[PDB]
Design a protein around this nucleic acid. Structure first.
Ligand SMILES: [Mg+2]
Ligand SMILES: [Mg+2]
Ligand SMILES: [Mg+2]
Ligand SMILES: [Mg+2]
Ligand SMILES: [Mg+2]
Ligand SMILES: [Mg+2]
Ligand SMILES: [Mg+2]
Ligand SMILES: [Mg+2]
Ligand SMILES: [Mg+2]
Ligand SMILES: [Mg+2]
Ligand SMILES: [Mg+2]
Ligand SMILES: [Mg+2]
Ligand SMILES: [Mg+2]
Ligand SMILES: [Mg+2]
Ligand SMILES: [Mg+2]
Ligand SMILES: [Mg+2]
Ligand SMILES: [Zn+2]
Ligand SMILES: [Zn+2]
Lengths: 402, 402
RNA sequence: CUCGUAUGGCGCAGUGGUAGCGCAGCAGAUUGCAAAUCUGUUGGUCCUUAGUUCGAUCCUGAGUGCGAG
RNA sequence: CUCGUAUGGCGCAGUGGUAGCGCAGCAGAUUGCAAAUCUGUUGGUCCUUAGUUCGAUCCUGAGUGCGAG
């Protein structure tokens, strides 16, 4: 049927260069899936692929959202799906490339629809949703559909809220809506993952940042600060829209000698981002597509043309020709990455909650662990031990007095 | 979503015993997928699972077709699909077990519908279909949609015919009908493959046959011969319906001291059957479901409870609980079976035809090879060589005669 | 004791110029027959020996093996 | 050759009764914010050392160490 090629991986692994080669080599167009590249201008820090390097290959859902807007999942779903459709009926093959792998879920119906399902929210319902109180919204969720509630932590405000929002707008338990989902890949998709050993990557990513603040990144940081300022924006705003970008909020303190510190902080966010991406690919993406993915070793850039270019053009050539793939799926070196051990094995599968009546966080609430495995980690952490000692010694004083 | 469990493998590997355990252990019913077990009575040779061993677990699409009928793919598709539906709405989980893995295709839309698409066949069209002439029907196919025709051998009458039949009844090129197919797994399916090393299996299968002609198989062979006779049936009939069974046509010569020979012939068909099943599972089934299958080592029956029962009950437990599977998917020992090398690598992917103008079969037609790889095998076979020598030596009598 | 036959794993063809086929084995295919069907292909130097002959798997002798009298 | 002064990977505190805070690091979560967000956690027993005291990282005397006339 209608094919679709997706390229996953961290940054600094040639995700773009490959997206193009395939585009020219197989008559396709690119669809961006980076939650930050969808914003206007600000290319250097948002790391966009320079036009004079796109060989005139079309690109969709990229650089068109105004800084005043807030991009999100569903928005991408309607936009991405449109590009796919269009590109198909035009006899071309879509090549979705991005860093926000979370969005890829759209390619296999992994989301709930609360748009078409309209419903006036009750004064009572809203008062609970938009409530300022902490666990008031959580206790409500536990009340109606405790199945889904036992899958989140009481502090996961963003999500606990979302869940309830669904229970209301759809009048159907979210937990049930899931046990009924298909989660089957739409269209015939081919997943290509460009990977590189952590160490070599980190080195590259570090330098990539160094000379990145030379090619004129600072000017973009200033520009963002311009819009940031003259708009009475507080640092709290760095949780929505283009303000989440890695390359701005890191220099906010410098923008009120110490600039060299905001850089290190940026380099760090970058590494963390890369690490989380791989974690997602191994524990979220792969498990979902049942491990139907092909790795491409991009550790030693020196090579690439062989380990990435050829290898991918090969797999893709067979894919497009609506045929089975004979490729190994993962080069001897990266074999373990596709192992159950490095993937579905790590997923949490025990959601029973536990509460330590002796441990409590700064927010006042008591420590609650999820999953027996982790409940024990806590019961053995220095945190718990220490608290357990002050408690005993305290309860002991009287034992002596008496 | 609605789950479905399938059990594949050769015979004599406990396919049934497992189908039951899972049925009791997970609230399910069995669906038979054996092209021969769907016939009435004749249990011993068709190897049906004795009732007093089904723990009262329901079974569908099994033992209900009258010897006068001819079961087939689509028939199974409508019947199997019905049992699935019914079993589902009743809160149960279907467990399809069978030896005819070819039928499993139904679980992932791998077929063409020429029923609902009615159309009066033209006198001209039919005259060509029901034609007695050899390659008359083939040349026609090559004319209308040569793409699909280059995928079959001119002697594959059964299939070349079917292909044309589709071109007519659907007025749409079959080749195109395929490039548009989805071939996506319907429902959420779990494939369990019960495998056993060839040697030990064969030993078991041989004895299984020995004492099989003791438990009263002969009486069934006689019964079949009864219906066979008093019906003016020729041995040619052993290409349709229950007459294809392995355990009858092998004794036809004995039914016109030499009986002991029909047995060996039977044991042989049995082995071949087992070997072809695995070839199918490795080159046909697996490649189609993208290798999403779990192996269960049943070589040493002595164990089984551990390698088969537990292992499967474990995977199944996680599967049913709508969760990701942490199981290894393949025991260290059988690992290579799921390798690309033992699967999609073996598939034919070069369909260009070749004709040896010097080699010809008894039917008079010339030898035609499919696939460069095989075209060369022919050009190097003793057959070709020998024919090439008589040709030269013969043409050498021309220089001398001139 | 009479007369026969002795060919790749088995069952069989064959010609005076160094041999073919069926089955099994191995392999490819499989979108209404599938426990079925189609397709390709690896194995022999024609029991041993001495002669006849330009030359023998095939002709003659002998030995050995199996075969019916 | 007189002074400061060094405490988990780094940056810094600190009570006589066997230690912290920030960074990082590790880990789990993710179904409209995801380059975000939530959550759980490994790390040194306090420069080396002799004594002072019931006791010591914190009191004292050396030796080590970087810096300081
Ligand atoms: Mg590159
Ligand atoms: Mg703007
Ligand atoms: Mg929200
Ligand atoms: Mg991390
Ligand atoms: Mg058993
Ligand atoms: Mg079959
Ligand atoms: Mg075979
Ligand atoms: Mg031959
Ligand atoms: Mg013989
Ligand atoms: Mg002969
Ligand atoms: Mg043949
Ligand atoms: Mg002579
Ligand atoms: Mg001689
Ligand atoms: Mg932290
Ligand atoms: Mg992310
Ligand atoms: Mg001391
Ligand atoms: Zn605690
Ligand atoms: Zn030839």
């Amino acid at each position: 049927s209608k094919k679709v090629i997706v390229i996953a991986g961290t940054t600094g692994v040639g995700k773009s260069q490959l997206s193009i080669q395939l585009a020219q080599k197989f008559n396709g167009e690119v669809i961006n899936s980076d939650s930050m590249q969808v914003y206007k201008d600000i290319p250097i820090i948002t790391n966009k692929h320079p036009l004079q390097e796109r060989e005139g290959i079309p690109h969709h859902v990229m650089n068109h959202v105004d800084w005043s807007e807030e991009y999100y999942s569903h928005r991408f779903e309607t936009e991405c799906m449109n590009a796919i459709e269009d590109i198909h009926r035009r006899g071309k093959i879509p090549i979705v490339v991005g860093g926000t792998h979370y969005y890829l879920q759209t390619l296999f119906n992994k989301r709930v629809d609360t748009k078409s399902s309209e419903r006036k929210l009750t004064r009572k319902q809203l008062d609970i949703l938009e409530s300022t109180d902490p666990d008031v919204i959580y206790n409500t969720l536990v009340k109606c559909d405790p199945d889904i509630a036992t899958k989140y932590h009481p502090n996961d405000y963003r999500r606990v809220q979302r869940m309830l929002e669904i229970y209301y707008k759809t009048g159907k338990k979210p937990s049930e809506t899931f046990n009924e989902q298909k989660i089957t890949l739409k269209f015939d998709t081919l997943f290509l993952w460009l990977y590189s050993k952590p160490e070599p990557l980190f080195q590259r990513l570090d330098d990539r940042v160094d000379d990145m603040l030379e090619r004129g990144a600072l000017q973009e940081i200033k520009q963002l600060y311009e819009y940031y300022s003259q708009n009475k924006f507080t640092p709290e705003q760095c949780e929505n829209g283009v303000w989440q970008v890695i390359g701005f909020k890191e220099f906010l303190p410098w923008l009120t000698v110490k600039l060299e510190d905001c850089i290190e902080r940026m380099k760090t966010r970058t590494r963390q981002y890369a690490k989380r991406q791989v974690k997602w690919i191994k524990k979220m993406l792969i498990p979902d597509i049942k491990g139907d993915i092909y790795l491409l070793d991009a550790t030693d850039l020196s090579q690439w043309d062989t380990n990435a270019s050829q290898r991918a053009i090969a797999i893709s050539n067979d894919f497009i020709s609506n045929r089975p793939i004979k490729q190994e799926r993962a080069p001897k070196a990266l074999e373990e990455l596709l192992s159950k051990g490095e993937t579905t094995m790590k997923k949490l599968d025990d959601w029973t909650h536990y509460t330590c009546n002796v441990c409590r966080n700064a927010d006042g609430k008591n420590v609650v662990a999820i999953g027996e495995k982790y409940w024990k980690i806590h019961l053995g952490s220095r945190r718990h031990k220490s608290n357990l000692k002050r408690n005993t010694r305290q309860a002991d004083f009287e034992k002596w007095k008496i």
